[PDB]
Symmetry: C2
Subunit: 93 residues, 2 copies
Amino acid sequence: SHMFVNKDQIAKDVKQFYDQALQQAVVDDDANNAKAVVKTFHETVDCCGSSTLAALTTSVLKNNLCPSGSNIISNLLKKDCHQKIDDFFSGKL
Amino acid sequence: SHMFVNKDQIAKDVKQFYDQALQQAVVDDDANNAKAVVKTFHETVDCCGSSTLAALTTSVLKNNLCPSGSNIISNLLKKDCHQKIDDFFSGKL
C-alpha cells in the first residue's frame, strides 16, 4: 500500500510512453490504435504534441489528431503534453 | 521528486475515473469522447468492463467498445479492467 516513489521518474516513464504512441501515430496509417490512443489522450487532457518530439507535432496536428480548434497559433499559448504530464506529477496545481 | 504514496488509493482513483468514463460511454451516444476513451483503454490494456459496474459491462460489449473477439464467454477467463488496474498498482507482476 504505502510506498516511496520518485515522481520525476514516473513523469519520465509516462512521457516516454506518450512519445512512443506519438511516433507510431504520425508515421503509420496502419497503426490506428496508436492514432486512437493519441487523439483521445489529446482530447481528454487538452494538449497537442511533445517537447522531445516538437518537429513531429506538426504531423499529428495536420492529421487531425489534436483537439478541434487546435492550431499552430492557438497552441503557442497552451501547455504541450509533456508540460502537462510534468505539472501533474509536480502537483504544481 | 521522492515522496510517500498510497498505491491502493491511487488504484481506487484510477478505477473511479474508469467507472465514470464507462458509465458515460454506455448511456450517451452523444458522449463519443467517453466511448473513445473507453474503447482505446480497453484495446490498449486488453480488458473489458468493471467490477463495480458488472451489469453495465454488458452494454459496452454490445456497442463494440471492447477488444475484437472479446465476448461474454472469452471474457470469463480474462481479468477485467479493475483487476488489471489493481494488479498493476500491486506490482504483482
